[PDB]
Amino acid sequence: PLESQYQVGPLLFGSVYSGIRVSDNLPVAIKHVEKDRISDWGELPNGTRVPMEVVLLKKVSSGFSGVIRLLDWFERPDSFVLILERPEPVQDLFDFITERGALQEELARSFFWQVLEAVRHCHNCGVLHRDIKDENILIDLNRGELKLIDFGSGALLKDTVYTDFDGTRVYSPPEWIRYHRYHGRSAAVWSLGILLYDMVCGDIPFEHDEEIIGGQVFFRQRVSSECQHLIRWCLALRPSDRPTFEEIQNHPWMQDVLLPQETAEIHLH
């Protein structure tokens, strides 16, 4: 029983509703996914064919708070319904950067570090998100914790070449623009570079295909040299020239990160 377990509220295109689990008044998000619109499918351990998004959410569901938790799912004649965690109070990182403009580097450091841990968590679980961007990152404003959301463009992590993609073009790497291929980790690092520039300059650096493949990064905001260098490194044109996740977290700009609660007390309360 789906409508008998959740009190459904208002919208949050895309069809996600605010909800409360009647059991315990827990805030949830209720996401509807039309079967006709589903790119990749997967099979659950039961063999029950489900959307790949459900498969990926289950593989990352193991307890670490950096990734959105899938709480339940239902099948309907023409759709799947996903019951997802909803922090409250919350704001996604896109609206947060819109309202506040370029972030202080201290705050961008904490956020970016939390995104890095969350993406490491996905990869450790065999999951490639493929749509990292500020819109797909939620800020729990009281805990100061970031949540990665919307795995609807993701895929199982593999080491061979990808030739499909359904993420956000302005966050896709030049090898996707030019040759329709990429490898998972190095394409994720590129999108992390776009994300980092987005945090410290107040918007993404590239809107057009020629800018993406141009390999030129102009800084519109005062940004420290160490941060510019990390950004430029993540945005290396050659995928093999990009840093590993470990190289990113050992970079000098990434040292002395704030704890989530410090981040909430200093920058969010």
Binding site: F13, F94, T98, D131, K133, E135, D150, G152, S153, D166, G167, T168, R169, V170, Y171, G202, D203
Partner: peptide, 8 residues
């Protein structure tokens, strides 16, 4: 300069 969301 107009900042915008970008559908996937």
């Amino acid at each position: 300069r107009k900042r915008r969301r970008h559908p996937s």
